[PDB]
Design a binder for this molecule. Structure first.
Ligand SMILES: CO[C@H]([C@H](C)/C=C/N(C)CO)[C@@H](C)C(=O)CC[C@H](C)[C@H](C[C@@H]1OC(=O)C[C@@H](OC(N)O)C[C@H](C)C[C@H](O)[C@H](C)[C@@H](OC)c2coc(n2)-c2coc(n2)-c2coc(n2)/C=C/C[C@H](OC)[C@H]1C)OC
Ligand SMILES: CO[C@H]([C@H](C)/C=C/N(C)CO)[C@@H](C)C(=O)CC[C@H](C)[C@H](C[C@@H]1OC(=O)C[C@@H](OC(N)O)C[C@H](C)C[C@H](O)[C@H](C)[C@@H](OC)c2coc(n2)-c2coc(n2)-c2coc(n2)/C=C/C[C@H](OC)[C@H]1C)OC
Ligand SMILES: Nc1ncnc2c1ncn2[C@@H]1O[C@H](COP(=O)(O)OP(=O)(O)OP(=O)(O)O)[C@@H](O)[C@H]1O
Ligand SMILES: Nc1ncnc2c1ncn2[C@@H]1O[C@H](COP(=O)(O)OP(=O)(O)OP(=O)(O)O)[C@@H](O)[C@H]1O
Ligand SMILES: [Ca+2]
Ligand SMILES: [Ca+2]
Lengths: 360, 360
């Protein structure tokens, strides 16, 4: 009878819609603009007025850090993007792996006390992605605009002790591509120019199967070169930039980070898990998030994990075509399930206990 | 107190000696002979017994590809050419640009585990050549018997993203000269006959300043003709063959290759480098390797880069007279430097970590 809302709060993009739908109805930037001199603006409007506004990202590395601006994002999501009255819909919110308890309580408080929701729930993003692939056991690589995680999941639940995190994602890859092209004589600095580079990244970048062979090919021929036309009609051609950019995921030292690459964090996560469930994890590597959209990434992961894993182990990388929205879809499904309707944290329950009722 | 060894492993010739000396004491062919029916032979001995041996080149296009035969080359280098005991000398080895990491680890393993060296180091050949010219910033064209590279170098370090490679060098030029003379009625096929053509190439070939004017001169007069006496007393005269041969460096289509010429790869390398350091690269083009020994090559490069580069740019091609051995000399110097003695990878360090300690 009543429709649940699903809201996936990302570092770069907010994905929102109605439980049961196959895609989010709303997808907009996680930005809040406030007049340097309406007291606030959200998303594309905030960016269109950037010349007179101070732009802020309320979610950093997947964690909400500015609560006033986050209320404005949720307000815009409910009233403008979805045109619902939040007091009439159970609302499923998503959170990043390793989100502090206090942070989850604050989300719970805002939903109940500011938006007056009748019931709500907070789910881990990576766990939702797994569900969206039809599995309750597996290991997810979730890479977005702000953070990357490996989350091993067993019988529906994440194993927090074996979660690995890499503070490097899409925004950093875009920054790196901006920096490379700029050194080459072009100038990509403004936010307008950042949107151009983001588009170049999404359209022309790919993950090399063998980075070293690819660099050799690029050095000895132009067979890997692609051309991109800028808005002013000017043309820019890239070669090894196409794959050096996402290679950073596997070699964080490319941007001065000492961290392990996504292939190593994947193997390390599995290796922190119970020896008796590793077989199932190796066989169920699910990729999720926009930064896993690079052509070649699955084959490259397959190759890297195979080299680290014992020789007899069956390795399988699942990379669904709708993985830009896997998290949201996982939430739409869960929130639709008959079994799940007893899991909602009700307003009455919140009024009874405190925000600490939310800890699952 | 202890003398370091320098060993420069080329596709055609091995150059080896002692750090501090002004030239390699040993220079011999990179060949290993194994009896079709001593289990092995190296260099000039292998070639003298070619009629009953299978000859193999363990380094192809500057990259080591046969490790068993390479051990034999190093063994011969240490024990026979230099008459040293490798366990008493730090040893500096050279590698080609874009050498795979795994390849460098295998060299490291052999040096420590098979020859028991006390300490060693692997340096990029082109970078050494630059050092031998008294510079830590510049762009080197390195052309030998098996491969050609452009390596831009800034404050002592190669910029791997802007390295260009041309899979064409001296061996291919010799092959081309063999093929041309053979079509002309002569027969140059055997390895003995290849040595004759190599000698003709080295003695009589040159790079034309203007290829098209030179072809016209050759067509309308005999003023460019030179005569060469074969071992049997027979005389062969060449005209446009003298400069058509090395022209291949600038026009790879002469041997059916779609690749860019050495002038284009030079400009392209500079253009992949930071715009703010190009001025310094244009002003510091160093030539290195035997295939850069052709009379006329510097003036021709000067002319070609000038035509591609912006009109106000100062272009300078440095072609040292000892450039057959620039790489080795650069290594002799580095390995002698007081500053460099802390850079050696020690046996203890190798025993501590793995072969991966070698990545500079
Ligand atoms: C009750 O929740 C518990 C536990 C209490 C919670 C724990 N946490 C929250 C934890 O941390 C939890 C362990 C649990 O059971 C999770 C169950 C998962 C959500 C999930 C459930 C199953 O759910 C699933 O297995 C999901 C898969 O469905 C099937 N049949 O395989 C998804 C497909 C692989 C791909 C999509 O179809 C594809 C992406 C696309 O298809 C066009 C699609 C787009 O939107 C949707 N599908 C969609 C939107 O809503 C729905 N689908 C939907 C709503 O109901 C259904 N689908 C129904 C079918 C029933 C499924 O049976 C196969 C369903 C049982 O299991 C993988
Ligand atoms: C410490 O190494 C770092 C870094 C850690 C390493 C990085 N990589 C390895 C990187 O990828 C690196 C950045 C670095 O500093 C490189 C330094 C270079 C090797 C080089 C060093 C200089 O070294 C140089 O600048 C080299 C030049 O010397 C001078 N004075 O100009 C060479 C001449 C131009 C030509 C030769 O004289 C000529 C070919 C011939 O002369 C008859 C000759 C033949 O053999 C030799 N010379 C010879 C053999 O050993 C030596 N010379 C020798 C040993 O010590 C010296 N020379 C000494 C003089 C000191 C130089 O000062 C001018 C010396 C400081 O700089 C161009
Ligand atoms: N085809 C593509 N190729 C590469 N990257 C892409 C592609 N499409 C989108 N992206 C990148 O994915 C990111 C958005 O993904 P997503 O919406 O999953 O992240 P998010 O949830 O906002 O951030 P996070 O999960 O880090 O908090 C952006 O950085 C975007 O540039
Ligand atoms: N005077 C000369 N003119 C032209 N070519 C020459 C001359 N002297 C030597 N060569 C050529 O240079 C090559 C040897 O140069 P070098 O020793 O620098 O190469 P390498 O290091 O063995 O090979 P690579 O660097 O490709 O692995 C041979 O092909 C030889 O014919
Ligand atoms: Ca996300
Ligand atoms: Ca060489």
């Amino acid at each position: 009878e009543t429709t649940a809302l699903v809201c996936d709060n990302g570092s770069g993009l907010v994905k929102a819609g109605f439980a049961g739908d196959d895609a989010p109805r709303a997808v907009f930037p996680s930005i809040v603009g406030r007049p340097r001199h309406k007291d606030s603006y959200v998303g594309d409007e905030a960016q269109s007025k950037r010349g007179i506004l101070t732009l802020k990202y309320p979610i950093e590395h997947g964690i909400i850090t500015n609560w006033d601006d986050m209320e404005k994002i949720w307000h815009h999501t409910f009233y403008n993007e979805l045109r619902v009255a939040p007091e009439e819909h159970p609302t499923l919110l998503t959170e990043a792996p390793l989100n502090p308890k206090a942070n989850r309580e604050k989300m719970t408080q805002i939903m109940f006390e500011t938006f007056n929701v009748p019931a709500m729930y907070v789910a881990i993003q990576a766990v939702l992605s797994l569900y969206a692939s039809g599995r309750t056991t597996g290991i997810v690589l979730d890479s977005g605009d702000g953070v990357t995680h490996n989350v091993p999941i067993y019988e529906g639940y994440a194993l927090p002790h074996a979660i690995m995190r890499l503070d490097l994602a899409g925004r950093d890859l875009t920054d790196y591509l901006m920096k490379i092209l700029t050194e080459r004589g072009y100038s990509f600095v403004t936010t307008a120019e950042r949107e151009i580079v983001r588009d170049i990244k999404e359209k022309l970048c790919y993950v090399a199967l063998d980075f070293e062979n690819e660099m050799a090919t690029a050095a000895s021929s132009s067979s890997l070169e692609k051309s991109y036309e800028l808005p002013d009609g000017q043309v820019i051609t890239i070669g090894n930039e196409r794959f050096r950019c996402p290679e950073t995921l596997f070699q964080p030292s490319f941007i001065g980070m000492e961290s392990a690459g996504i292939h190593e964090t994947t193997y390390n996560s599995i290796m922190k898990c119970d020896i008796d469930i590793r077989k199932d994890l190796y066989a169920n590597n699910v990729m999720s998030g926009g930064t896993t959209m690079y052509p070649g990434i699955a084959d490259r992961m397959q190759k890297e994990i195979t080299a680290l894993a014992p020789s007899t182990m069956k390795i399988k990388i699942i990379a669904p075509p709708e993985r830009k929205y896997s998290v949201w879809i996982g939430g739409s499904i869960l929130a639709s399930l008959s079994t799940f309707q007893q899991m909602w944290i009700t307003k009455q329950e919140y009024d009874e206990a405190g925000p600490s009722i939310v800890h699952r």
